[PDB]
Chains A and B, each alone.
Chain A
């Protein structure tokens, strides 16, 4: 059965967008270190307390590896929160020969547990 997915809700203000990284599964480690270090350099200009690191699914483990790096080697105070994430998925329900993407699309919700990780200055 053919089914496709969509990304998640990101309700963000003017100040939340420049201090939050969303870690993918294809995100490299040292790339994430450089981006969160640039966020720690720019958070004084943004003027907020923490830098947020959010992950869901396969990235979560290596997302936690980010919290395993800056807590010990750079003495940063981190906060770990476990959240739920709703994801809408378009699925095909059987009811000529048409193209595979041109079928009946029905929305179905699917919940995934994820990790938010706040890093202080």
Chain B
């Protein structure tokens, strides 16, 4: 041991840091790994060891040299013709859909014969050879048609001859096989939509598509399942008198604004199903709705598919003057989300004419921001088929590197209503979308045109006003869900969709990922976060209860959590009752509303409430709880489909003044939607109980909110937590997931408005499933 100088010390330690870094890099280089493992974990290909074409071209030479260093069937007389029948059917189907003509209905139904299909495809070619008339002759080479049903619902689409009996029970997305190669889909409704990506993308979609600032990417959702109807007034060519009335009948006076007539912005809100038979009006909460208008009179309304069938049935009930237009297989939108989604979307499309909407969209595409733009951003134009490009390329002008809010206000002042609404009129009418397919080419044809440009003359195919299929294209902003949705015809979507993620910073969304996006932005979701409505309550309660009951009876005894014997749940443990509040599974709003009306009957009976000891005399809590258990035991035998139990309050508080016989459950209870954030340690889960702060213990929770902990220096909650009573419950968290954008726990709950006006402070405690701890938090109101 001997003292050294300062400079020699810092030089020796810096040389040691450099030596350790060089040794770590040398160990990482001497670790025997392939160049196949040199790819990122998103791009790793298992079949790249078989064929080299998955590997990047810079790396394929090393892959070839290391792969070199490392190193017509028996068919009977019947199944041969059975195999040749399919090959002949595919060949005749390709020639029939390619040459001139459309599809017969007998081949579409595919429930009679295959020899009749062969004879029909043989007969159509001969009829085209012998004569020009009597032919349903198409307008293009690729087999595209017009699946538009005027005044009736759209039937099962024709699709392809080979993949026809695969569409017998459920229909497909236009990107069905493409999404099927890259995602997990579930079969729930009549379509088959994506559920989750194959590679893990929880935190990935959370960071790139989320509300986080570090969102250097783009996320695309196939939202073709969202069904739209187009309504137009046939009675008068003048101003729309019945349109405002039918909007005020379908929705409330919440979405019938004069502002939405003037500024024509799409609005998403809550629709409720009306029913007027004779002098009586019954209103039930129906679900979400998207309303959009064209300057005064024509309207597109798009929403959830079962709700779409119900709204179409109610609209077909009263169809006296106005003409309805069902669009299930002729128009669909896809949803882009993120910071660079606008840049990739402007990269995917090009211009065919110098217009104002191109200039507005190209300036919007460069700012890389969403919420700084105003509420109305609905752009529409005519563009080229994106099969002309087939390459990831972006187009950006000089623009002198300047972005200010003054140019945004200048685009807000000047809005090209005429051309955008003309594109709207083109997409609503069935004749213009049919005229759009007048020059649709095959991939062989666009490859031949690219070869002609490579021979004559750059990576492009030029536009011709005579023989190129100019499409209508509409890109609009959706406000509360913070995402850009772009709508297009059915057979046009896939040439737009395939070129999207070939931009190297664009990934796809699943339905669980869309639920995560709606969970992150403090928003709401219809199959899960809407329990108040009829269909949401039915689907959520039935499916989650049956799934959880099958899982509970599926697990053996003594390995799962046992819900029957849990000690110390509430203070003063009530007799004939040892379990948790309601059923242990999915949210029992029936239990909550019967207990709320029981506490209301106790408050109407006396100024205070007693604790404990054909309908027996209600004087305390357990008489209400035994009636709850008896009603649950009765409804386990026969399912309930009579009425709802919990509506919302946010439409009732403003106007109806939330006003509420031997009755225990006839008049339902109204709720407001809240989002509570955890201030204490812990995270929430699904189906979580939501309780009041005690008034005797309010100062203790205020001291815990300010601060109290052991003198070590770190936070303490290992203390005697005072247990409140059973009837202090006010709500249910349906969606419980650890909120990564805040660093805490988020729970979407639904609390009573009378209970909300009881406490002067927003401090509300949460309790998980099968866990006997209480965690305080603070809620903010969800105005959705």
The residues of A with any CB-CB pair to B shorter than 8 Å are: 6-12, 14, 17-18, 20-22, 31, 86, 88, 90, 96-105, 107, 109
Contacts and interface: CB of A to CB of B under 8 A. Distances in A.
Contact of B403 (A9, A31, A88, A102): A9
A26 to B, nearest CB: 9
A11 B399 CA distance: 13
A37 B369 CA distance: 26
25 contacts: A9-B372, A9-B403, A11-B367, A11-B368, A11-B369, A12-B339, A17-B213, A17-B214, A17-B339, A18-B214, A20-B213, A22-B213, A88-B372, A88-B374, A97-B654, A99-B254, A101-B783, A102-B254, A102-B257, A104-B259, A105-B259, A105-B375, A107-B374, A107-B409, A107-B412
Contact of A18 (B216, B367, B368, B655): B216
A103 B257 CA distance: 8
B31 interface: no
A53 B185 CA distance: 42
Nearest to B252: A99
Interface of B: 213-216, 253-254, 257, 259, 339, 366-369, 371-372, 374-375, 403-405, 408-409, 412, 654-655, 743, 783
A14 B216 contact: yes
A26 B368 CA distance: 24
A4 B71 CA distance: 68
Indicate the member of A96, A99, A100, A107 with the most B CB atoms within 10 Å.
A99
A50 to B, nearest CB: 17
Contacts of B372: 6-9, 88
Given A18-B214, A107-B374, A11 B783 contact: no
Contacts of B367: 9, 11
Contacts of B375: 90, 105
Indicate the member of A7, A22, A101 with the most B CB atoms within 10 Å.
A7
Closest CB pairs A-B (n = 3): A86-B405, A11-B403, A17-B216
A86 B404 contact: yes
A59 B337 CA distance: 28
A24 B436 CA distance: 50
Given A88-B374, A88-B405, A10 B783 contact: no
A41 B215 CA distance: 19
A102 B256 CA distance: 10
A18 B339 CA distance: 13
Contact of A31 (B215, B654, B743): B743
A98 B257 contact: yes
A12 B654 contact: no
A45 to B, nearest CB: 13
Contacts of A10: 213, 368-369
Contacts of A7: 369, 371-372
A107 B214 CA distance: 27
B100 to A, nearest CB: 48
Contacts of B743: 31
A109 B783 CA distance: 25
A96 B371 contact: no
A7 B371 CA distance: 6
A34 B403 CA distance: 31
Nearest to A104: B259
A21 B214 CA distance: 9
B339 A98 contact: no
A96 B404 CA distance: 38
A79 B724 CA distance: 55
A97 to B, nearest CB: 7
A12 B342 CA distance: 13
Contacts of A107: 374, 409, 412
Nearest to A103: B259
A86 B371 CA distance: 13
Nearest to A14: B216
Contacts of A17: 213-216, 339
B415 to A, nearest CB: 13
Contacts of B409: 107, 109
Contacts of B403: 9, 11
Contacts of A86: 404-405
Nearest to B215: A17
Contact of B405 (A9, A90, A97, A102): A9
